[PDB]
Nucleic acid binder design. Structure first.
Ligand SMILES: [Zn+2]
Length: 271
DNA sequence: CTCTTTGTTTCTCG
DNA sequence: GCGAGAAACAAAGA
């Protein structure tokens, strides 16, 4: 998932599990707890979930008064709230059991991670990750963005995917943003003029906020939290290879850019 | 059978 | 430092 999908999960978890006491924690794949599963089980069993926050694509469970469970869903991670008698599914890895249900984490590719850290370690954790600003008008300063783009010869799509200029774009929304801002994904960032950078800055905020409002993009239907999204119906280029650009009628093309499938309109996004 | 592809991140290599 | 390529892993499609 990307930031809008993680935010959608965050909001659903906030509504449903805040106030829940963790009765037990079980793992069939304990190695995805990078801080140690048995340590996490000992520390968190019996504690109450107080909140759920997000930074970039990271989910943050606030548990007890001093614990923060940092969860990254990577490519395929999925949470669901299930009955206590729910049958195991093949790629379920972890569960937090409450009195009236359980929160199960599944991840086909086993890429997702859990890390248990303390409250005062959260800000240093993300500083060490070098995560850039949240994609909001308040936090995403166009002036610093412009200065960083001016200094670099990196290509704009890979640079945006780094999470350092701004947090939260992945392959879907970076392709969507670059189409909206009429920028080719291989454009070296020091070639972007001020007006293009301004449009890019605003487009990043606008499409991620739109995606949040619509509950994220569900490319396939799934049975988990954050799976009732509608933003997939608004995608203009991602996965639209061979379909016509909604602005100019040219066929959307797919190329490979720094190892990633990349969808663009060759007319609207001049090389 | 092989090769490629996939919502992410983070590594080695030269 | 940099880019290119690949790995962590599993499944589906060509
Ligand atoms: Zn076009």
């Amino acid at each position: 998932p990307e930031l809008p999908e993680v935010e959608t999960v965050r909001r659903e978890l906030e509504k449903r599990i805040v106030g829940q006491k963790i009765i037990s924690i079980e793992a069939t794949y304990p190695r995805m707890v990078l801080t140690g599963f048995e340590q996490l089980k000992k520390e968190l069993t019996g504690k109450t979930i107080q909140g759920i926050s997000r930074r970039g694509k990271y989910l943050i469970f606030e548990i007890g008064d001093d614990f923060r469970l940092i969860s990254h869903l990577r490519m395929e991670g999925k949470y669901r709230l299930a009955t206590l008698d729910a049958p195991r599914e093949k790629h379920d890895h972890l569960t937090m059991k409450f009195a009236d249900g359980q929160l199960i984490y599944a991840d086909v590719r086993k890429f997702g991670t859990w890390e248990l850290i303390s409250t005062d370690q959260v800000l240093p954790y993300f500083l060490k990750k070098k995560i850039g600003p949240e994609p909001t008008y308040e936090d995403f300063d166009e002036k610093l963005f412009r200065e960083k783009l001016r200094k670099s010869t990196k290509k704009i799509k890979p640079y945006l995917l780094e999470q350092t200029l701004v947090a939260g774009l992945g392959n879907i929304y970076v392709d969507e943003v670059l189409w909206l801002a009429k920028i080719h994904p291989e454009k070296e960032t020091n070639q972007l003029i001020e007006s293009s950078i301004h449009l890019l800055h605003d487009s990043i905020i606008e499409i991620l906020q739109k995606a949040i409002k619509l509950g994220g993009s569900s490319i396939r239907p799934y049975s988990a939290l954050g799976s009732t999204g509608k933003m997939q119906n608004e995608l203009q280029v991602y996965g639209k290879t061979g379909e016509k650009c909604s602005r100019c009628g040219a066929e959307i093309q797919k190329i490979k850019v720094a190892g990633r499938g990349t969808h663009f309109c060759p007319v609207c996004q001049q090389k």
